[PDB]
Amino acid sequence: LVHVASVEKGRSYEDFQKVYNAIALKLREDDEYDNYIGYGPVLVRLAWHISGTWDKHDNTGGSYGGTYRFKKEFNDPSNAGLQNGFKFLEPIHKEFPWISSGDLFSLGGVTAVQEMQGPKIPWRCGRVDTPEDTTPDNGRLPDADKDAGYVRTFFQRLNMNDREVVALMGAHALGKTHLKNSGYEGPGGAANNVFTNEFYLNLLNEDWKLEKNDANNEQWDSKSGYMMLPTDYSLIQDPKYLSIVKEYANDQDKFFKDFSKAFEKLLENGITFPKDAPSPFIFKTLEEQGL
Numbered sequence: 661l662v663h664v665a666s667v668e669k670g671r672s673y674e675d676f677q678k679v680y681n682a683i684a685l686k687l688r689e690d691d692e693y694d695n696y697i698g699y700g701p702v703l704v705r706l707a708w709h710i711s712g713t714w715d716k717h718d719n720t721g722g723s724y725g726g727t728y729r730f731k732k733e734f735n736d737p738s739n740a741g742l743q744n745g746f747k748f749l750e751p752i753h754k755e756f757p758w759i760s761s762g763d764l765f766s767l768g769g770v771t772a773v774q775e776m777q778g779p780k781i782p783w784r785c786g787r788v789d790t791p792e793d794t795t796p797d798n799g800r801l802p803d804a805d806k807d808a809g810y811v812r813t814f815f816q817r818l819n820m821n822d823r824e825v826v827a828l829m830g831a832h833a834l835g836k837t838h839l840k841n842s843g844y845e846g847p848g849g850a851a852n853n854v855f856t857n858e859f860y861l862n863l864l865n866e867d868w869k870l871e872k873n874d875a876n877n878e879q880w881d882s883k884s885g886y887m888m889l890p891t892d893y894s895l896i897q898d899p900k901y902l903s904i905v906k907e908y909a910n911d912q913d914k915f916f917k918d919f920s921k922a923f924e925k926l927l928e929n930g931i932t933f934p935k936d937a938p939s940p941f942i943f944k945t946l947e948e949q950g951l
C-alpha cells in the first residue's frame with residue numbers, strides 16, 4: 661500500500677507559511693480555551709492521534725489520508741476531546757480550502773509546538789485526502805493503564821525505538837488530562853502551554869503517589885498538584901527508559917532536537933516522498949516575523 665506525496669497544485673513555502681500564520685494567530689486569539697491553556701496542546705494531541713493510527717506492517721492508517729474527518733475515526737473513544745482541535749481548525753480550512761486534511765491536521769501540531777516555544781519541526785506537504793473506506797478501525801491508539809513493556813511493544817508498530825518513544829512522551833508536559841475525555845484528571849506540569857523538558861524533570865524530581873481518581877482509575881499524583889499516567893511513570897520504572905529520561909532532564913537542547921526528529925517522523929510515517937519533492941519547510945514563528 662503506497663501513498664505518494666502530491667504537492668497541492670502550484671503551492672510553495674509561502675502558501676504554507678500563510679496557513680501556519682493563520683493557525684498561530686488564532687492560537688493567540690482564542691486564549692481562553694481550557695481555563696486559559698489555549699488550543700496548543702490539543703492541536704499537538706490531534707496531530708499525534710491522526711498519525712498514531714499507522715501500522716508499519718501494511719501501511720494502513722497514518723496522517724496521509726486525513727481520515728479523522730470521517731465519523732468512525734472522529735468518534736473513536738481514544739479521540740475524545742479532539743473535536744475541540746478539529747473545530748479550531750475548521751475556519752482555517754475554510755480560508756484555505758486547497759490544503760489537504762492530513763496536511764492541515766499535521767501542520768496544526770507543528771504550529772502549536774513552535775508557537776509554544778518548542779523546537780522547529782521541519783514539515784512536508786503533499787498528504788492527499790482518501791475516501792471514507794480507508795479510515796482505520798478504532799483501537800490503534802495506546803492505552804494509558806499499562807506498563808513499560810506495553811509501551812515499548814506498542815510503539816514498534818509505529819517504527820519507534822526507545823529514544824524516540826521517550827522523546828515523544830515529553831509532549832505530556834503540555835495541557836492536561838480531562839476526566840470526561842479519558843478517565844484521568846490533572847496537568848502534568850506547571851507550564852501547561854510552554855514546550856520545555858519539564859516532563860522529565862517532574863518525573864525525576866517530584867514526589868509521586870499512586871492514587872485513584874474520581875473515575876476509579878489509578879494515576880500518579882504529586883503534592884505539587886501534577887499527575888502522570890501509568891504509562892508515563894513506566895518511563896522511570898524501566899531501566900532503559902530511565903536512562904533516557906535522565907538524559908533529557910539534563911539537556912534541553914538534546915530533547916528539543918530528538919523530539920523534532922521523532923515528531924516529524926511520526927507525522928510522515930506511511931508517506932512516500934518523490935525524489936524531486938520539495939525539501940521540508942521550516943516555518944518562521946509569528947515572533948520571528950514580527951507579527
Ligand code: HEM
Pocket residue numbers: 701702704705708740741802803804805811828829831832834835836837838839841842843844889891923
Ligand atoms: C503511551 C502513549 C500515550 C498515551 C497512553 C497517551 C495518553 C494520553 C491521555 C490519556 C491524555 C489525556 C486526554 C484527555 O483527557 O483529554 C493525553 C493527552 C495528551 N497527549 Fe498523550 N498519550 C500518549 C502519547 C502521546 C504522544 C506521543 C504525544 C505527542 C507527541 C502526546 C500528546 C498529548 C498531548 C499534548 C496531550 C494534552 C492534550 C490536552 O491538553 O488537551 N501523547 N494523552
